[PDB]
Amino acid sequence: PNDEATIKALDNVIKQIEALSVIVNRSEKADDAQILGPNTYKQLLEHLFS
Amino acid sequence: PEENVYILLPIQAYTGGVIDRRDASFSNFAYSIASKLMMELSAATHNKIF
C-alpha cells in the first residue's frame, strides 16, 4: 500500500471540510415601508349668494 | 528572576489553524491544528530514523 496516496487524500478532505466551515450567511434586507412625503388639501370651487 | 528559580517561558511553535466560523464546536479547531501540524511533521521523517 503506497503511502503517499492516503496523505494526499486526507489533505484534500481536510482542505474541503475547512473550506465548507468558513461560509457564513448574513443578509442585509431593507424593510418594505414607504416614506410618505408631505401633502396639502385641494379646495374645490363653489358658489355663494344671499 | 532570582536565585534558584528558572522560568521556562512558552514560545509559539506552529502558527497555523483557522477559527471555525460556525462556532458550533471547539474540538474542530484543535483537530485542524493537530492534523495540519502532523502533516507538516510527517514530511520531515518520510523514510528517516533518528
Q: Which long-range contacts (CB under 8 A, 24 or more apart) does B42-48 make?
A: B42/A7
Q: Which three cell numbers stand for residue B10?
A: 512558552
Torsion-angle region of B16 (φ positive above 0: left; ψ -120 to 50: alpha; else: beta): beta
Which cell numbers in the block locate residue B36? 495540519
Q: Searching chain A, which residue's CA lies closest to the CA of residue B24? A: A21
Joined grid coordinates for residue A20: 465548507
Residue numbers in A near B21 (CB within 8 A): 21-24
Which method resolved this structure?
cryo-EM
Alpha helix ranges (H) inside chain B: 27-42
Cβ of A22 within 8 Å of Cβ of B28? The answer is no
The verdict on a CB contact (< 8 Å) between B35 and A24 is no
B20 CA: distance to closest CA in chain A (Å): 6
Q: Which residues lie below 8 Å from residue B27, measured CB to CB, with a gap of 6+?
A: none
